[PDB]
Symmetry: D2
Subunit: 263 residues, 4 copies
Amino acid sequence: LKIAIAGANGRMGRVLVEAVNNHPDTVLSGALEHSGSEALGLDAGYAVGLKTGIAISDDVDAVLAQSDVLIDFTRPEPTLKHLQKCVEKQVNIIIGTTGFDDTGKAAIHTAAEKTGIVFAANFSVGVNLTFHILDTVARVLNEGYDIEIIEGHHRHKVDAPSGTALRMGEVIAGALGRDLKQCAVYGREGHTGPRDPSTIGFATVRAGDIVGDHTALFATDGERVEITHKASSRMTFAAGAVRAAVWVNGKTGLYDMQDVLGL
Amino acid sequence: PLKIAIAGANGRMGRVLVEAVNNHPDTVLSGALEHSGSEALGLDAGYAVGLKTGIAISDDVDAVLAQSDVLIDFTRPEPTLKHLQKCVEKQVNIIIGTTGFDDTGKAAIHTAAEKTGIVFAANFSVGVNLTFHILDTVARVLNEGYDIEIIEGHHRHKVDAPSGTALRMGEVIAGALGRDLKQCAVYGREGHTGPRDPSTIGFATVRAGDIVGDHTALFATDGERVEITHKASSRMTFAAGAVRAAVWVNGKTGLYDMQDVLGLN
Amino acid sequence: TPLKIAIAGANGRMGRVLVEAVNNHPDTVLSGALEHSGSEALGLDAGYAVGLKTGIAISDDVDAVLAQSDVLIDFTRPEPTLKHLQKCVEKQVNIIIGTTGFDDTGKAAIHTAAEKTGIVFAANFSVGVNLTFHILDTVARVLNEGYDIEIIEGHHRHKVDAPSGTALRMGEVIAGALGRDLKQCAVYGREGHTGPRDPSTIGFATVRAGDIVGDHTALFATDGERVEITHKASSRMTFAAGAVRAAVWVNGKTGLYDMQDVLGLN
Amino acid sequence: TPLKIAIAGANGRMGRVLVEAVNNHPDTVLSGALEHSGSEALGLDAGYAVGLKTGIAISDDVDAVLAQSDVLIDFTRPEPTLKHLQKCVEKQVNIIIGTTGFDDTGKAAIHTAAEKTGIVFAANFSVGVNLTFHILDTVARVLNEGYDIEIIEGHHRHKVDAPSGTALRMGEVIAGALGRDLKQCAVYGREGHTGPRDPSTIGFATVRAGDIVGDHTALFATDGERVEITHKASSRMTFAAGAVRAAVWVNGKTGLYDMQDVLGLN
C-alpha cells in the first residue's frame, strides 16, 4: 500500500518514513515538504539511515496521484491546502495536526463525503486505549476516589498541561458528570486545606528530555489505581498513523481513532 | 441506613471493618461478634479505633443477628458455616470474605444462596477486581508486538510467589491472548537469557519491608509503555469493598461475586 | 541491662505506635506511659489498643514515671513538653522531642536543659527522610550543570499545607547547594503558556489524594538521563522507629543533638 | 578560549551523539572527525545527520585529528584505539577511552601511555550511574539493620544477559558495604513457596520488554518506609555527556583517571 508523508524532513515526518518501512502491508510512495525548504531533492530515508528509493518532492499535484494515502503532521494552515488536492484524486488522508480552527473543522466534515479521513488529536494506540479505559474506571470508582492527573514532559514544552492530560481530564469529568472548567486545580501553594471530593488535580512536571509521561490516579482509603502511559519516542504516534492508514481500505467518511481500535 | 454486623470484631480485619462501616454514609454498625472467652467482651466495638459506636462486643449470635440486615465475615470456615446457618434462619444477608472452603463447604454456600443473598469472593478489593476486567480489554487491543510483564511487590513475611493476584492477572492476559500460562510464564532471569520471546509473560517479584501489595501489569513495545497499576495501602482495601458489597446485596437472594457488585457483567 | 523508655501522650495516635516501636526494639522496654489527667484511658494497660500486654498502666503521674525511666519520648504539644522537660532535668532523664511549634523562649529552654541532660530535638524523625536530605546535597553538587530539578510529592486528602515541610526542606537543601534562593526560583504549578522552563527553576508538583501517608521524590533530569531519589512512608512507624533509635543513641550522653548526629551524617 | 575536541568513529552510533554533546557544552568546540580506513561517508559534514553545521569534512586520516586538538574521545574497538593512542601520545594530546572489554595486554598498554598523557578510562560513562554507585555506599551503611534490599532493573527485549552489568555492580557495592558476599546472598527470581524472606538476601527483579534503554532502581525497605534510588537512561546521550565532561576535566592533566576522579568522589 502506497503511503505519502508530508513534512518529510521534519521531526515527526522522519519517524513516519521509518514507520512505513516497519509495517509490512505498507511501502513508501511519496514525500512532500515546503516549497523552499532544503529538503527537496534528497532521499526520504536518508536521515534515518536507509535507502528510501524516493526523492523528497514539493509537488502536491504529482505525488498524490501515485499514492493511496497521505499522512500529515504539519502546521494547521497548509493542511487545509493539502486536504483540497487530496479530495480531487480520490485519495485517503490521515490528519495528525491538532489545535485547529472551528471553521476548519467543518472543512474536514465536508471533505469526508468524498474520501476517507481519520481525524484524531493523538495517534498513539496506548493513549487512545487509555482514554477508553478511563471512562470505565471513572464509572466504577465514582464515589470516594480522589482524581489526579500527573504529567511529565521535556523542558522545551510551552503549554501546561498537555493536550493529552486535558483530554484525560475531559473523559473523567464527562463520565462523572462534572465540569472540568469548574473543578480543575493546576497547582498547590499554601493552605490548600482538605481536598474537595469534586476536585480533579493536575500536577505538571517540566524537565530534561522527557517525551511524554502521563498517569491518571484514583485514590481512596485503602488503595490506589493508576493508569499510566509512557512514550519512548515519536514512533508511538507514527505507528498509530500508519495503522490508521492501513485501516482505511478505500473507506469513506470521518473516523475517530477509536474506530480503528474497535472501541 | 443499613444495619451491619461484624464477625471477628476484635481481630485485625474486624477493626478495619468497624471503620469501614462508620465511613460509609449509608451504613451503621448494629453488632460486633467475637468468640466466648474473648478478653474484649463487654467493651465498645470502637474501643481501639477511636469511635463510640454504642454497640458492645458480644458472643450472642442469636441476639445480634436479630438486629441486623447484613453480616460481614472474614473469619474461618467452621465458624463461617455456623454463622451462615443462622443467617438463613433470620433472613440476614452475608458477605463472605473467608477463604479455604472445601468442596463440601462451597456446596453449603450454594444451597444457602437459594434462601438468602450472598456475596462470596476471593478478593474484596474494588480496584483489584476492576483491574482484572480492564486487563482483558488492554490485552486484546495490545495483542501484536507488546511484551507483557507482571511486576509485584509484597512484605517480607509473604510465603507465596507470585501472589494469587499476580497469577490471576496473568491468567486473564493469557486467556485473552490465547496463550497457556504454564508454558509461557517466566519467574526470573539469570545469566545469558538471550532475546526475549514475544510470547513470554514475565513475572518480577519484590519481597521487602512492610509492603501491603503493589501490582503492575506492563505492556511494552517500540515507542511506548502502558501500565495498569494497583497499590494497596492497608487492609481497608478489602473492608471498603465488603461494605460496598453489603450495600449492594441488601434485600436480594442468590449468589454473587465482586463482578456483580461493580456492574462488570 | 535493657533501656527504660517512657512514652508521653501514650493514648494518642503517635503514642500507640511508639509503644509498638519500644516493644519491637530488642534492647528497649517500656517503663512508663503518660497521658494528661482526665484521660479516658487512665488505668488501662499501655498496649490495650495494639494487642500487647506491656504490664504498665497509663498514668498521669509524671514524677513517679520519670523516676523509673532512662529516656522520655514526647510527640505532644509545647506547653506539656516544656513541663515534662523540667521534670526530666530534675530526675536526670534523657528526652526525645518530636513536638513542633516551640517559641524562641521554649527553644532557649531546650538549649539550657541540654547542659544537664541528653536531648534529640528534630523536626522529622524518619531515618530515610533525614538520609534523603543528606544525599540530596551530594547529588545537587555533582549534577549542578544542565539538570532540571523537580520535587514531586503526594499526600492524603486531609493534608492542609502544600507543599509539605519535607518537600520544602528538600528544596532548601538543593537550592543551598546550588547557590540559588528558593523564594526566587520556586514554581508551584503550571497552567497555560508557561513557555520554556528556565534553567534556574526548582519545580514543585503536589498530589493530594486518598490516604497517602507521604511520598516524596526529587527528580534530576537532563538530555539522556534521569536521577530520582525517593522516600515513601507506609505509616507513622517511620517516625516512631527513628525516635526509639534516637533514644538508644543518646543514652549516657549530654547535650543537644538532631537526627543527623544519630545517623552519623555530620 | 573553548576546548578543542576530536571524535573517533564519527559516523557510528555513539559518535553521532558525541557530536551533539560537543556542541551542547558551551566552552567546547569540535575540531575533527576521524573514521575507519575507507568508510562510505568520507567528505560529508560531521554533523550531517545530527542536525547542525560543524564545518568539518569527515576524514580517515589520523594526522588531522591528532593535530590541532586538545582531547580525543574514542568509543571504537580494541584494535583502532591502541593505534590512535600511539599517535596521541606522540602529539601530546589527552584521550578519553570509552571502549570496553580490553585485552589484558591492552590494559597494560593504557597504563604506560598514561605516563606521558592524560587518560580517562572507565567502564560506564554516565554521570548518573557513577553517582548512583557512590550514593548506594552511603545509603547501605546508614540503612544496615532491618532494611530489605532489592535491585529492580528493566531493559529492552533484545538484551541477552540478566541482570545488567550495572545492576550487578550496584549489588556489589551494596554487598561490599554490608560485608556480605553477592554470590552467596543473591536471588534472581521467585516461584512457589519462597517462604519468609531471609534478612541477608539481596533480591534481583529483572524486566525484559519493549524498547527500554535502561532503568535501574535500588530499593531499601523496612517497617514504615521505603527508600528508592533510581537511574533512567533516555538515550546514548547519557554516556556522551559524561565523556565530554571528562574531556573538560582533563584540560591539563597527565595520568590515569576514571569517572570517580572526574566527579570528585574519592
